């Protein structure tokens, strides 16, 4: 019953399995994790010497 | 009817109150704001609010 004082001191509550909607806020967001998953160059590098079309140039012959 | 002693759970955040008996030391950690100094501000306020007991 001492942890009640530690609880109101720290403002905590039972995090999993209570169905009060708070889990959907305190969950980490996967939005950064979903879009950093891929890596596609545009097939035409703006620097120079794009290989993705050099292969086309080599197989043209 | 079995559970690990180290729950080490997730899907939440907190101030993580903890004590270390090995060196007789309490440990509180930071998790809410992105920068470290904003968290230092929050835990410093929590330390002041801790001493209101």
């Amino acid at each position: 019953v001492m942890h009640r004082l530690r609880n109101t001191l720290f403002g905590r509550a039972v995090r999993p399995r209570e169905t009060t909607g708070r889990r959907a806020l305190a969950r980490p967001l996967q939005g950064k994790a979903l879009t950093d998953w891929y890596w596609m160059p545009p097939n035409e590098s703006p620097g120079f010497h794009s290989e993705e079309d050099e292969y086309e140039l080599r197989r043209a012959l | 009817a079995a559970r690990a002693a180290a729950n080490a759970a997730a899907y939440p955040v907190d101030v993580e109150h903890s004590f270390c008996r090995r060196t007789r030391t309490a440990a509180l950690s930071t998790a809410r704001y992105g920068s470290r100094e904003a968290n230092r501000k929050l835990l410093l306020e929590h330390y002041n609010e801790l001493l209101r007991a």
């Binding site: 995090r15 999993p16 399995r17 969950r27 | 009817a1 079995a2 559970r3 690990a4 729950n7 080490a8 759970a9 997730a10 899907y11």
Partner: peptide, 24 residues
């Protein structure tokens, strides 16, 4: 089921006696 539904043994076979940790 090795007593899959109602035992203190077959429920370690069905992964329930180990209560699933809260994770996501």
């Amino acid at each position: 089921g090795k007593g899959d539904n109602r035992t203190r043994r077959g429920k370690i076979f069905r992964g329930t006696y180990r209560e699933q940790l809260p994770s996501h």
